[PDB]
């Protein structure tokens, strides 16, 4: 099976340095671009860094541009984040994320288990932070963006993710309509322009958790604030 | 002071054998070098990493035989430079850049022919996907950055009867430059084209223990005499001639021999290359 | 052994191919003509679309 | 004893089916479609050029979404191209370089390729590991694979050089049907639109129409003088067209059992490597061996276009499922996408 | 210009092009030999000397990599798949020398070496091998030297005005093979007289194909 295990996190002094390793197994690691995406405790997700296939493109977030270094080792199948000048804001959980890009591709499809580090643009409008519901009824989670994600470039680069409690995020919808691999057909995605929605009909008990809308129209990659589904 | 005139008694006949020759290089370089570039631009199959060297060489003398040749065919005809000094200052740079690029491109074609035959596992270890463009731009940033310090001295020399450097002010840097282009212009088109012939003879001489170089030698002589007829007379005259005590007609002979390099190159490197003739055939079939 | 079996299977194959019904060539040609003239507007190589609807500009 | 009377019976009842075909020819396609208007000069232009193959290109198959394609070349490579952006979606290194056909599954999940190794390989395009690897190797032919088409992600019809077509199930790997009856090497097959029949062409100038479920030769079509290299169905499935080495295309009908129209010009001497139909069936695009790709008015049999852009033999061609473009691959290692303008 | 996923797709396609070009150059430095001849003329002897579809043999010698394609098992129609070998480096056509007087089994009226000249005429002036040099192996000549002293060569050759010794007969057979070459300017035939006890046949195919390779590189530079 596909597997990504991260290590290196723990207690550090502020302003220091730390190595984050993501060991990969069971997929063509050289063919996949990789990302780091972190999540502060009881907060949403924010994209940290991106290295391409063959290291031909390296993008950062401006929060960490100049302080973080992302570097892949393909013969060892490892991904590395060298972290310099670690302030107290960088206490989070880090996720090492596969992503492959061609026609009809499913980016961001398998997220790693993440490691915890403790040290001491387009904006996605996801304003409804909690929707209470009971199993069996349809829920519609909505999301709005700063600018439009659809034009004559063809697609609409909105990505719906789901994080169950105690787990990594998991891709539900990519490019606003297309259901991922390993998720049931009750999840639907629709919308137009700046306004999009995720429909969960016939809802079971394992859909409890936080739902995120992400954009992939241009870097940097920005998530929503989250939408919790409970009870 | 500084005058722009050529008139002398020795050159009054030779000017005709210049101008009737000068309309030859202007008419065998504007059809021999545009056909090579049409064969390279139309069919993208023969844009190999070796044939880009022939593209650089046929761009190094299209500049000569299209622009700088008809401006030195009336200077031999009217015996005074009909334009100004600030065009002479750039003619003297372009004329020597369009020869230094051509000479270093010949010295790279000889290495790209020795490598494509003797060590063919090293030809894309040296000429990579953009090591080729590095080797093409290092001909033009050496052809114009070694002749740019000689910018103010590009005067109308009446001994050569062309806008060129003057041979008293150019000392000792320009004789050092011509000696540098001698000791690598002859250690490349002579050493590599003889190691190629040695490899061809050594290959055909191993099929004689299993018993009981005819046109390769002609081509390896045709790409050495047609170089040696062009640049060794000029580079041997204008080095040992400390003063200009040599006559006007021997200087115009040694400088009218470097116009051969803009004619013999579209017939040595295009009309004899099988890829380019096959390209003409594929164009004339399509 | 083999030639008699090959010939009997050949005549059985050709007699079942004889036992088919064949329409007149006028009706089949008119069927092809009607399919061509009933799908002509949906042929971008026959009647070419403008460049706003062409994916291969 | 019995073989002489049996072959005299064979001659007798094939003259019976000859006279039965002769009984139906009330009129030919020419004076029937003599009243309709021609299509004009089909001026088509090259739009993309797919470079990256380093040997002869032997087959291409358009994807059903009319944007992806797969091409096979004898440099050992199967390339999945995005035809809109000229992107190379996938590069598949084959085990046997001598590939002569390639097929794209109508779901887009698989590609099949086969060649001189007599194996039809099935490759999974959409795997969880990210790459493309071999799902199945259909071994069981004793001649070269000359064509292959998918019906499902599971059922695939192949033509071979050992005079047999076959129908395979992929998940078991075994033949579920062996279509026998050709005497020469079978070069091409073409599935019907409803995938219940398929025509086939062989080197003995025969096009056999087979039923896929019953596994029997429904009809047999003659009229060509030499090897039939490529075959293609009309888009409504009630006719098909063959292209043979005698510089002639022909159009047979499944119902009328006979040739209706012949596509031949005296200027053409060479073979025909590929035929395909447009989305309305009005244009038949035959890739000839004189390096061109001619375009025939398939109802009046006058040549209406030429696609001359290759420096070698136009080996494969194909029209998209929506009929936007035409991809021709050739032996000069270059695929070209074509369509016209207003 | 392009979206972020379009640009990462274009970067992926560039990596595909890079691996295609480096694999294509690594394959253009390969020696691809098409193996041809009659059945048991020494083909198994030379394929064990050099170490139902196609049978490819890959080996290496003096840091040069050879692939050799045997299409003897292909009982298909040869006029439909021989252009797949248009562009091989050399054709290794193998002929036994001791079959000048022996007769084929299927017809029992044609000579075996006459069938070898018919096959060499079909291979040599073929339209797909006009530029392909033909290495010509002549095998088991140690039995031919015993067959030439008792049985005369004049059974196969009417217009043979030569001696019945070994070297004159071998030179006559070699010249009669090499004179079927109808395009002698574009290709050249390399001939070898081998046995079962010699060690130097892979060395011969290495030297002959080094000559073919150097002439090909001369023709691609422009020196031809
Ligand atoms: C005044 C003089 C220097 C003018 C010269 C103009 C022309 C010849 C110049 C000189 C340097 C040249 C380039 C040198 C090398 C390459 C790389 C090759 O893969 C394509 C052509 C290209 C990109 C050339 C294009 C023309 C060029 C830009
Ligand atoms: C080899 C180093 C560069 C020297 C260039 C040699 C060829 C010069 N060509 C000239 N051509 C003229 O017509 N007049 C000249 O003065 C010179």
The CATH number of whichever domain residue D276 belongs to comes to 2.130.10.10
Q: Does D128 touch chain A (CB under 8 A)?
A: yes
From residue D155, alpha-carbon distances to A173, D66, D121, D181 in Å are: 31, 22, 13, 21
Q: Which of E176, E97, E111, E191 minimizes the C-alpha distance to E144?
A: E97
Taking every pair of Cα atoms in chain C, the longest distance, rounded to a whole number of angstroms, is: 69
Q: What are phi and psi of D163, to 5 degrees?
A: 65, 15
From residue B12, alpha-carbon distances to B18, D199, E38 in Å are: 10, 85, 78
Q: Cis omega (within 30 of 0) on the bond before A220?
A: yes
Q: What are phi and psi of D181, to 5 degrees?
A: 145, -15
Q: Report how far residue A154's alpha carbon sits from residue E210's, in angstroms, rounded to the nearest whole number.
A: 54
Pick the CATH number of C4-56 from 3.30.465.10, 4.10.260.10, 1.10.10.10, 1.10.40.50: 4.10.260.10
Q: Report how far residue A9's alpha carbon sits from residue A41's, in angstroms, rounded to the nearest whole number.
A: 14
Strands D77-82 and D68-73: antiparallel
Q: Which of E180, E21, B160 minimizes the C-alpha distance to D54?
A: E21
Q: What are phi and psi of A188, to 5 degrees?
A: -130, 150
Q: Report how far residue D301's alpha carbon sits from residue D284's, in angstroms, rounded to the nearest whole number.
A: 9
The helix (run of H) or strand (run of E) holding residue E55 is: strand E55-61
Q: What are phi and psi of A214, to 5 degrees?
A: -125, 150
What is the distance between the terminal CA atoms of chain A, rounded to a whole angstrom?
32
Q: How big is the CA angle at A131 (ends A125 and A136), to the nearest 5 degrees?
A: 130
Q: Report how far residue C25's alpha carbon sits from residue D23's, in angstroms, rounded to the nearest whole number.
A: 10
Q: Report how far residue B150's alpha carbon sits from residue B164's, in angstroms, rounded to the nearest whole number.
A: 10
Q: Report how far residue D200's alpha carbon sits from residue D210's, in angstroms, rounded to the nearest whole number.
A: 8
Partners of A163 in beta bridges: A169, A210
Q: What are phi and psi of B92, to 5 degrees?
A: -65, -25
Taking every pair of Cα atoms in chain A, the longest distance, rounded to a whole number of angstroms, is: 50
Q: Report how far residue D7's alpha carbon sits from residue D15's, in angstroms, rounded to the nearest whole number.
A: 12
Q: Where in chain A is the domain with CATH 2.60.40.10?
A: 3-119, 130-223
Chains in contact with chain D (at least 3 beta-carbon pairs closer than 8 A): A, B, C, E
Q: Is E189 helix (H, G, I), strand (E, B) or coil?
A: strand
Q: Which of B267, B263, B265, B257 minimizes the C-alpha distance to B228?
A: B257
Report helix, strand and coil shares of chain E as percent, to nearest 5: 45, 20, 40
Most D CBs within 10 Å, among C28, C33, C50, to test the D interface? C28
Q: Report how far residue E147's alpha carbon sits from residue A5's, in angstroms, rounded to the nearest whole number.
A: 76
Give the count of domains, chain D.
Answer: 1
Atom of ligand 2 nearest to the CA of B230: 7
| The pair of three-digit structure tokens given for residue B223, joined into one six-digit string | 């790409």
Within a domain: residue E110?
yes
Task: Say which of D68, D87, D129 has its CB closest to residue A28.
Answer: D129
Q: Does B278 touch chain D (CB under 8 A)?
A: no
Q: Report how far residue C44's alpha carbon sits from residue D282's, in angstroms, rounded to the nearest whole number.
A: 11
Q: Check if B162 has its Cβ closer than 6 Å to any atom of ligand 2.
A: yes
* Residue B159 CA to its chain's centroid (Å): 22
* Residue C44 CA to its chain's centroid (Å): 21
Q: Does C7 touch chain D (CB under 8 A)?
A: yes
**Residue C16, Cβ neighbours under 10 Å: how many?**
12
Strands A11-12 and A115-119: parallel
Q: Does D289 touch chain B (CB under 8 A)?
A: no
Q: What are phi and psi of A89, to 5 degrees?
A: -75, -25
What is the distance between the terminal CA atoms of chain C, rounded to a whole angstrom?
65
Q: What are phi and psi of B239, to 5 degrees?
A: -105, -50
Q: Report how far residue E140's alpha carbon sits from residue B121's, in angstroms, rounded to the nearest whole number.
A: 37
Q: How big is the CA angle at C20 (ends C17 and C25), to the nearest 5 degrees?
A: 110
Answer whether A72's CB lies under 8 Å from A28's CB: no
H helix count then E strand count, chain E: 6, 6
Q: Which of B149, B179, B180, B153 minimizes the C-alpha distance to B164?
A: B153
Helix axis angle, B32-42 relative to B51-60, nearest 10°?
Answer: 140
Resolution in A: 3.0
DSSP E105: T
Q: Report how far residue A68's alpha carbon sits from residue A18's, in angstroms, rounded to the nearest whole number.
A: 10
Q: Report how far residue D8's alpha carbon sits from residue E140's, in angstroms, rounded to the nearest whole number.
A: 52
Answer whether B77's CB lies under 8 Å from B15's CB: yes
- Asked if chain C contacts chain A via 3 or more Cβ pairs within 8 Å, the reply is no
**Residue B267, Cβ neighbours under 10 Å: how many?**
13
**Residue E140, Cβ neighbours under 10 Å: how many?**
19
CA atoms within 13 A on the CB side of E81: 29
Give the count of domains, chain E.
Answer: 1
Q: Is E96 helix (H, G, I), strand (E, B) or coil?
A: strand
From residue D30, alpha-carbon distances to A180, D302, E195 in Å are: 54, 10, 67
Answer whether D281's CB lies under 8 Å from D293's CB: no
3-state secondary structure chain D: CCHHHHHHHHHHHHHHHHHHHHHHCCCCHHHHCCCCCCCCCCCEEEEEEECCCCCCEEEEEECCCCCEEEEEECCCEEEEEECCCCEEEEEEECCCCCEEEEEECCCCCEEEEEECCCCEEEEECCCCCCCCEEEEEECCCCCCEEEEEECCCCEEEEEECCCCEEEEECCCCCEEEEECCCCCCEEEEEECCCCCEEEEEECCCCEEEEECCCCCEEEEECCCCCCEEEEEECCCCCEEEEEECCCEEEEEECCCCCEEEEECCCCCCCCEEEEEECCCCCEEEEEECCCCEEEEECCCCCEEEEECCCCCCEEEEEECCCCCCEEEEECCCCEEEEEECC
Q: How big is the CA angle at E32 (ends E31 and E33), to the nearest 5 degrees?
A: 110
Q: Which residues are within 8 A (CB) of A41 and not within 5 positions of it... i.e. 6 or more apart?
A: A91, A92, A93
Q: Which residues are within 8 A (CB) of D152 and not within 5 positions of it... i.e. 6 or more apart?
A: D106, D107
DSSP E123: H
Ligand nearest to the CA of B72: 2
Is E160 exposed, middle or buried (CB count within 10 Å of its CB: 0-12, 13-18, 19+)? middle
Residue environment code for E186-207, b if the CB has 16+ CB neighbours within 10 A, otherwise e: ebebbbbbbbeeeeebbebbbb
Atom of ligand 2 nearest to the CA of B231: 6
Q: Which of D284, D287, D256 minimizes the C-alpha distance to D274?
A: D287
Q: Does E220 touch chain B (CB under 8 A)?
A: yes
Q: Look-up: residue for tokens 């062996």? A: D178
CATH number at residue E183: 3.40.50.300
From residue D168, alpha-carbon distances to B116, D72, D187, D285, D329 in Å are: 49, 21, 18, 30, 27
Answer whether D333's CB lies under 8 Å from D320's CB: no
Is C56 exposed, middle or buried (CB count within 10 Å of its CB: 0-12, 13-18, 19+)? middle
Q: How big is the CA angle at D182 (ends D177 and D186), to the nearest 5 degrees?
A: 85
Q: Check if B255 has its Cβ closer than 6 Å to any atom of ligand 2.
A: yes
Residue numbers of the domain that contains E215: 27-221
CATH 3.30.565.10 is the classification of domain A3-119: no
Q: Which residues are within 8 A (CB) of D177 and not within 5 positions of it... i.e. 6 or more apart?
A: D166, D167, D212, D215
| The pair of three-digit structure tokens given for residue D12, joined into one six-digit string | 């007798």
Nearest chain D residue to E85 by CA distance is D98
Answer whether A172's CB lies under 8 Å from A164's CB: no
Answer whether D194's CB lies under 8 Å from D151's CB: no
Q: Look-up: residue for tokens 């294509």? A: E24
Q: What are phi and psi of D268, to 5 degrees?
A: -100, 125
| The pair of three-digit structure tokens given for residue E208, joined into one six-digit string | 């002959």
D51: chain B residues, CB-CB within 8 Å: 44
Q: Which of A175, A193, A190, A210 minimizes the C-alpha distance to A140?
A: A190
| The pair of three-digit structure tokens given for residue D200, joined into one six-digit string | 């086939």
**Positive or negative torsion for Cα B134, B135, B139, B145:** positive
CATH 2.60.40.10 is the classification of domain A130-223: yes
Partners of D175 in beta bridges: D168
Q: What are phi and psi of D269, to 5 degrees?
A: -110, -20
Q: Report how far residue B146's alpha carbon sits from residue B179's, in angstroms, rounded to the nearest whole number.
A: 13
Q: Report how far residue D80's alpha carbon sits from residue B164's, in angstroms, rounded to the nearest whole number.
A: 58
E9: chain D residues, CB-CB within 8 Å: 82, 85, 87
Q: Report how far residue B203's alpha carbon sits from residue E214's, in angstroms, rounded to the nearest whole number.
A: 8
Alpha helices, DSSP H, located in chain E: 4-28, 43-49, 112-124, 141-150, 166-178, 202-221
Q: Check if B133 has its Cβ closer than 6 Å to any atom of ligand 1.
A: yes
**What is the rounded (10 degree) CA torsion for B151, B153, B157, B159?**
-110
Chains in contact with chain B (at least 3 beta-carbon pairs closer than 8 A): D, E
Q: Which of D201, E18, E209, B248 minimizes the C-alpha distance to D210?
A: D201
Q: Which of E89, E121, E95, E91 minimizes the C-alpha distance to E174?
A: E95
Is B21 exposed, middle or buried (CB count within 10 Å of its CB: 0-12, 13-18, 19+)? middle
Is D225 exposed, middle or buried (CB count within 10 Å of its CB: 0-12, 13-18, 19+)? exposed
DSSP E84: G
Q: Which residues are within 8 A (CB) of A195 and not within 5 positions of it... i.e. 6 or more apart?
A: A142, A143, A144
Q: Look-up: residue for tokens 């070209």? A: D336
Q: Cis omega (within 30 of 0) on the bond before B172?
A: yes
Q: Which of A69, A89, A65 minimizes the C-alpha distance to A15?
A: A89
Q: Report how far residue A24's alpha carbon sits from residue D298's, in angstroms, rounded to the nearest whole number.
A: 57
Taking every pair of Cα atoms in chain D, the longest distance, rounded to a whole number of angstroms, is: 69
3-state secondary structure chain B: CCCCCCCCCCHHHHHHHHHHHHHHHHHHCCCHHHHHHHHHHHCHHHCCCCHHHHHHHHHHCHHHHHHHCCCCCCHHHHCCCCCCHHHHHHHHHHHHHHHHHHHHHHHHHHHHHHCCCCCCCCHHHHCCCCHHHHHHHHHHHHHCCCCCCCCCCEEEECCCCEEEECCCCCCCHHHHHHHHHHHCCCCCCCCHHHHHHHHHHHHHCCCCCCCCCHHHHHHHHHHHHHHHCCHHHHHHHHHHCCCCCCCHHHHHHHHHCCCHHHCCHHHHCCCCCHHHHHHHHHHHHC
Ligand nearest to the CA of B147: 2
The helix (run of H) or strand (run of E) holding residue C25 is: helix C25-37
Q: Which residues are within 8 A (CB) of B218 and not within 5 positions of it... i.e. 6 or more apart?
A: none
Q: Which residues are within 8 A (CB) of D190 and not within 5 positions of it... i.e. 6 or more apart?
A: D149, D198, D199, D200, D231, D232, D233, D240
The CATH number of the domain covering residues in B11-285: 1.20.1070.10
3-state secondary structure chain A: CCEEEEECCCEECCCEEEEEEEEEECCCHHHCEEEEEEECCCCCEEEEEEECHHHCCEEECCCCECCEEEEEECCCCEEEEEEEEECHHHCEEEEEEEECCCCCCCCCCCECCCEEEEECCCCCECCCCEEECCCCCCEEEEEECCCCCECCCCCECEEEEEECCCCCEEEEEECCCEECCCCCCCEEEEEECCEEEEEECCCCHHHCEEEEEEECCCCCCCCCCCEEEEC
Q: Which residues are within 8 A (CB) of D242 and not within 5 positions of it... i.e. 6 or more apart?
A: D201, D207, D221, D224, D228, D230, D231, D249, D250, D252, D275
Is B225 exposed, middle or buried (CB count within 10 Å of its CB: 0-12, 13-18, 19+)? exposed
Atom of ligand 2 nearest to the CA of B256: 13
Answer whether D83's CB lies under 8 Å from D337's CB: yes
Residue numbers of the domain that contains D321: 45-340
Q: Report how far residue B60's alpha carbon sits from residue B62's, in angstroms, rounded to the nearest whole number.
A: 6
| The pair of three-digit structure tokens given for residue B29, joined into one six-digit string | 């370089």
Q: Check if B115 has its Cβ closer than 6 Å to any atom of ligand 2.
A: no
Answer whether D258's CB lies under 8 Å from D21's CB: yes
Q: Which of A34, A78, A29 minimizes the C-alpha distance to A59?
A: A34
What is the distance between the terminal CA atoms of chain D, rounded to a whole angstrom?
69
**What is the rounded (10 degree) CA torsion for B12, B14, B16, B18?**
-130
CB contact under 8 A, B269 and E224: no
- Where chain A is discontinuous (C–N > 2.5 Å), the residues before each break are 120
| The pair of three-digit structure tokens given for residue B264, joined into one six-digit string | 């013999």
Report helix, strand and coil shares of chain C as percent, to nearest 5: 55, 0, 45
* Residue D46 CA to its chain's centroid (Å): 22
Q: Which residues are within 8 A (CB) of D87 and not within 5 positions of it... i.e. 6 or more apart?
A: A102, A103, D81, E9, E10, E12, E13
Partners of D263 in beta bridges: D249
Within a domain: residue D237?
yes
Q: Which residues are within 8 A (CB) of D66 and not within 5 positions of it... i.e. 6 or more apart?
A: D320, D321, D322, D324, D325
Q: Look-up: residue for tokens 């009867």? A: B161
Q: Report how far residue D132's alpha carbon sits from residue B42's, in angstroms, rounded to the nearest whole number.
A: 36
Q: Does B274 touch chain D (CB under 8 A)?
A: no
């Amino acid at each position: 099976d596909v597997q990504l295990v991260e290590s290196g996190g723990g207690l550090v002094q502020p302003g220091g340095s730390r190595k984050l390793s993501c060991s990969a197994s069971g997929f063509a690691f050289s063919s996949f671009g990789m990302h780091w995406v972190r999540q502060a405790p009881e907060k949403g997700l924010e994209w940290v860094a991106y290295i391409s296939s063959g290291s031909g493109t390296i993008y950062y977030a401006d929060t960490v541009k100049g302080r973080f270094t992302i570097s892949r080792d393909d013969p060892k199948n490892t991904l590395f984040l060298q972290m310099t000048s670690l302030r107290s804001e960088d206490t989070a959980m880090y996720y090492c994320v596969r992503s492959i890009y061609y026609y009809g591709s499913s980016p961001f499809d398998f997220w790693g288990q993440g490691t915890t580090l403790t040290v001491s643009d387009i904006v996605m409008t996801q304003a409804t932070s909690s929707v209470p519901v009971t199993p069996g009824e349809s829920v519609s989670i909505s999301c709005r963006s700063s600018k439009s994600l659809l034009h004559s470039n063809g697609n609409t680069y909105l990505y719906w993710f789901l994080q169950r409690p105690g787990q990594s995020p998991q891709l539900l919808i990519y490019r606003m309509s297309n259901l991922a691999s390993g998720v049931p057909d009750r999840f639907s995605g629709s919308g137009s322009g700046t306004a999009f929605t995720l429909t969960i009909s016939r809802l079971e008990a394992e859909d409890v958790g936080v739902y995120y809308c992400m954009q992939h129209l241009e870097y940097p990659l920005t998530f929503g604030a989250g939408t919790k589904l409970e009870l | 002071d500084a005058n722009f005139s050529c008139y002398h008694e020795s050159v009054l006949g030779y000017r005709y054998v210049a101008v009737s020759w000068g309309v030859v290089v202007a008419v065998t370089g504007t059809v021999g070098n545009v056909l090579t570039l049409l064969a390279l631009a139309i069919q993208p199959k023969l844009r190999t990493r070796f044939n880009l060297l022939i593209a650089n060489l046929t761009l190094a003398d299209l500049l000569y035989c299209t622009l700088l040749q008809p401006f030195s065919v009336d200077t031999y005809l009217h015996l005074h430079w009909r334009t100004g000094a600030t065009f002479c200052r750039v003619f003297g740079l372009l004329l020597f850049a369009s020869n230094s690029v051509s000479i270093l491109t010949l010295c790279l074609i000889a290495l790209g022919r020795y490598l494509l035959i003797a060590h063919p596992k090293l030809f894309p270890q040296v000429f990579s996907a953009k090591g080729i463009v590095l080797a093409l731009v290092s001909t033009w940033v050496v052809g114009v950055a070694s002749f740019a310090p000689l910018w103010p001295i590009y005067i109308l020399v009446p001994v050569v009867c062309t806008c060129s450097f003057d041979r008293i002010r150019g000392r000792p840097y320009t004789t050092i430059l011509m000696g540098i282009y001698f000791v690598l212009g002859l250690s490349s088109v002579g050493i590599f084209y003889c190691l190629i012939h040695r490899q061809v003879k050594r290959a055909a001489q191993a099929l004689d223990q299993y018993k009981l170089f005819g046109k390769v030698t002609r081509m390896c002589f045709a790409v050495f005499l047609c170089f040696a007829l062009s640049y060794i007379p000029f580079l041997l005259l204008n080095i040992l001639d400390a003063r200009v005590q040599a006559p006007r007609v021997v200087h115009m002979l040694a400088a009218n021999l470097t116009w051969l390099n803009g004619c013999i190159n579209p017939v040595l490197y295009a009309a004899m290359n099988r890829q380019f003739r096959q390209a003409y055939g594929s164009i004339l079939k399509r | 052994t083999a030639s008699i079996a090959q010939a009997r299977k050949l005549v059985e194959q050709l007699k079942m191919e004889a036992n088919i019904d064949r329409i007149k060539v006028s009706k089949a040609a008119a069927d092809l003509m009607a399919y061509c003239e009933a799908h002509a507007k949906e042929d971008p190589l026959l009647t070419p679309v403008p460049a706003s609807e062409n994916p291969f500009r | 004893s019995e073989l002489d009377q049996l072959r005299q019976e064979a001659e007798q009842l094939k003259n019976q089916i000859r006279d039965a075909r002769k009984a139906c020819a009330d009129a030919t396609l020419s004076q029937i479609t003599n009243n309709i208007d021609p299509v004009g000069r089909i001026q088509m232009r090259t739009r993309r050029t797919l470079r990256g193959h380093l040997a002869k290109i032997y087959a291409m198959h358009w994807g059903t979404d009319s944007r992806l394609l797969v091409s096979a070349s004898q440099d050992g490579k199967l390339i999945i191209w995005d035809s809109y952006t000229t992107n190379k979606v996938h590069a598949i290194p084959l085990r046997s370089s001598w590939v002569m056909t390639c097929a794209y599954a109508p779901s887009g999940n698989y590609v099949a390729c086969g060649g001189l190794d007599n194996i039809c390989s099935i490759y999974n395009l959409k795997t969880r590991e990210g790459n493309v690897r071999v799902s199945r190797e259909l071994a069981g032919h004793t001649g070269y694979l000359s064509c292959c088409r998918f019906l499902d992600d599971n059922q695939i019809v192949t033509s071979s050089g050992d005079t047999t077509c076959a129908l395979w199930d992929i998940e078991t790997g075994q033949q579920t049907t062996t279509f026998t009856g050709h005497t020469g090497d079978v070069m091409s097959l073409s599935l019907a639109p409803d995938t219940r029949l398929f025509v086939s062409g062989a080197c003995d100038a025969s096009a056999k129409l087979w039923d896929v479920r019953e596994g029997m030769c429904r009809q047999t079509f003659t009229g060509h003088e030499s090897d039939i290299n490529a075959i293609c169905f009309f888009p409504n499935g009630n006719a098909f067209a063959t292209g043979s080495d005698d510089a002639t295309c022909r159009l047979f009908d499944l119902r009328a059992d006979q040739e209706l129209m012949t596509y031949s010009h005296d200027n053409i001497i060479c073979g025909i490597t590929s035929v395909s139909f447009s989305k309305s069936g009005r244009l038949l695009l035959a890739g000839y061996d004189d390096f061109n790709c001619n375009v025939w008015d398939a109802l009046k049999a006058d040549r209406a276009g030429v696609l001359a852009g290759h420096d070698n033999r136009v080996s494969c061609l194909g029209v998209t499922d929506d009929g936007m473009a035409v991809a021709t691959g050739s032996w000069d290692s270059f695929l070209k996408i074509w369509n016209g303008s207003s | 210009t392009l979206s972020a996923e379009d640009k990462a797709a274009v970067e992926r396609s560039k990596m595909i092009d890079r691996n295609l070009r480096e694999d294509g150059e690594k394959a253009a430095r390969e020696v691809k030999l098409l193996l041809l001849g009659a059945g048991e003329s020494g083909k198994n002897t030379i394929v064990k000397q050099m170490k139902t579809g196609i049978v490819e043999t890959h080996f290496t010698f003096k840091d040069l990599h050879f692939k050799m394609f045997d299409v003897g098992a292909q009982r298909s129609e040869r006029k439909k798949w021989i252009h797949c070998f248009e562009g091989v480096t050399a054709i290794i056509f193998c002929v036994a020398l001791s079959d000048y007087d022996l007769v084929l089994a299927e017809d029992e009226e044609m000579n075996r070496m006459h069938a070898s000249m018919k096959l060499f005429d079909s291979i040599c002036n073929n339209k797909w091998f006009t530029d392909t040099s033909i290495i010509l192996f002549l095998n088991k000549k140690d039995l031919f030297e015993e067959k030439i002293k008792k049985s005369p060569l004049t059974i196969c050759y009417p217009e043979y005005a030569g001696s019945n010794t070994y070297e004159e007969a071998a030179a006559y057979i070699q010249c009669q093979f090499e004179d079927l070459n109808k395009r002698k300017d574009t290709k050249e035939i390399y001939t070898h007289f081998t046995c079962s006890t010699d060690t130097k046949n892979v060395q011969f195919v290495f030297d002959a194909v080094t000559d073919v390779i150097i002439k090909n590189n001369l023709k691609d530079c422009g020196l031809f």
